[PDB]
């Protein structure tokens, strides 16, 4: 189906404890494929998926240079942002950036992204047009004016429509064994008595890839959204994900409850009930 490539970057200042730490990771879909950490003993971009290992030394040299240069511009940016927000030099602050592209099944660009946050808050984002900006506040408007003057958006558009899409196509081919395989959830329902009057029903989804899933409970065919405890989808550590959804069921009502599961690896959505 559709696919994405995303690069994530975080710099965190630590006054009195050296220079800001810089961490960047790259993903295709929900698969980590590269990482760089400035606190590593000998910082280099390193592979994290088998299909990127075949890239040759020129790729790793170039990527490592880009990462080191970005660590440095982030340090400058952290200094700039103290000025823009009238802040002291004493505190720790955070700068985040994400960029990348989404493509459809035919490999064509669906949309691109390039966006920043400062101290956990949206700062400036490239709009879906790849030509104009959304600034969150009057500080980000100063950046907007600078980036308009320098025609930054045009440079980003060229990358996002060109290299970003073409890299993703290459990776999807080289990684076709895994990137183009959906692992469906393994599903079951468990029952956990609470008191004489009620019990929990928990609907499980295990071992699935990619992470996107829908997992709901119905009672007599009516969605139980407000009464469902739905945990965040969580990584298993073997590339796959896990999720569960639970409801509190009055004694004797179990067969009125059904769990519904939707995932791209399922040819049809599943319906499950507790099986004593």
């Amino acid at each position: 189906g559709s696919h994405s490539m995303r690069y994530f970057h975080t710099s965190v200042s630590r006054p009195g404890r050296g220079e800001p730490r810089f961490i960047t990771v790259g993903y295709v879909d929900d698969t980590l494929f590269v990482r760089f950490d400035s606190d590593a003993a000998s910082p280099r971009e390193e592979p994290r998926a088998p299909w990127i290992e075949q890239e040759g030394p020129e790729y790793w040299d170039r990527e490592t240079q880009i990462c080191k240069a970005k660590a440095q511009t982030d340090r400058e940016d952290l200094r700039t942002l103290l000025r823009y927000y009238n802040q002291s030099e004493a505190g720790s602050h955070t700068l985040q950036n994400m960029y990348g592209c989404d493509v459809g099944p035919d490999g064509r660009l669906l949309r691109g992204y390039h966006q920043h946050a400062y101290d956990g808050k949206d700062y400036i984002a490239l709009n879906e047009d790849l030509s104009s900006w959304t600034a969150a506040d009057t500080a980000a408007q100063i950046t907007q004016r600078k980036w308009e003057a320098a025609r930054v958006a045009e440079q980003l558009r060229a990358y996002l429509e060109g290299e970003c899409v073409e890299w993703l196509r290459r990776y999807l081919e080289n990684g076709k064994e895994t990137l183009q395989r959906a692992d469906p959830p393994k599903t079951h329902v468990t029952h956990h008595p609470i008191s004489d009057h009620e019990a929990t029903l928990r609907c499980w989804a295990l071992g699935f890839y990619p992470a996107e899933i829908t997992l709901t409970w119905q009672r007599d065919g009516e969605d139980q959204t407000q009464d469902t405890e739905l945990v965040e989808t969580r990584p298993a550590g073997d590339r796959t994900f896990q999720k569960w959804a639970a409801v509190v069921v009055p004694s004797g009502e179990e067969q009125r409850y059904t769990c519904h599961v939707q995932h791209e690896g399922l040819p049809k959505p599943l319906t499950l009930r507790w099986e004593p």
């Binding site: 990462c67 940016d77 700039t80 950046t143 980003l156």
Partner: peptide, 9 residues
């Protein structure tokens, strides 16, 4: 592969 385009706020 990454964007090689220095961009400062």
């Amino acid at each position: 592969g990454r964007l090689n385009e220095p961009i400062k706020v």
